Amino acid sequence: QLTEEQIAEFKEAFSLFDKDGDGTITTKELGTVMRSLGQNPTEAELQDMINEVDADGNGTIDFPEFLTMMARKMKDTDSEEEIREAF
Ligand SMILES: [Ca+2]
Ligand SMILES: [Ca+2]
Numbered sequence: 001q002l003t004e005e006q007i008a009e010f011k012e013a014f015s016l017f018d019k020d021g022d023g024t025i026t027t028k029e030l031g032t033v034m035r036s037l038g039q040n041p042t043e044a045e046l047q048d049m050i051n052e053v054d055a056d057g058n059g060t061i062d063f064p065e066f067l068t069m070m071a072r073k074m075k076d077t078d079s080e081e082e083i084r085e086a087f
Contacts, residue, residue, distance in 0.1 A: 002067075002071050002074070006074070007067060010063075010066065010067050010070045010071075011063060011067075013066075013070070014063050014066045014067075016033060017029050017030060017033050017061075017066075018063075019032065019033075023062055023063060024060035024061060024062050025050070025060060025061040025062075025066060026050070026059070026060045026061075027043065027046040027047050027049075027050045027059075027060075028046075030046050030049055030050060030061075031043070031046045034046065052069075053065050053066070053068070053069040055068065
């Protein structure tokens with residue numbers, strides 16, 4: 001239901017954040033991507049983004065947490081699209 005190619009696209013997306021390729025997205029890395037996107041999250045915001053999806057509380061987001069976020073975002077999106085369909 002999440003599909004191989006999607007997890008592969010998620011891994012690839014993950015590496016856009018996990019820039020040192022260390023397997024985790026750290027608030028720095030998120031912050032760096034966020035800023036490259038012209039956003040300017042605060043550490044608190046970044047930390048909080050990391051924190052919401054940091055299932056294991058180790059302070060960074062590893063691929064499985066990332067995938068879970070993305071998977072659920074994907075679910076949520078589909079579910080919102082469905083609701084939009086009904087709206
Ligand atoms: Ca990293
Ligand atoms: Ca983690």
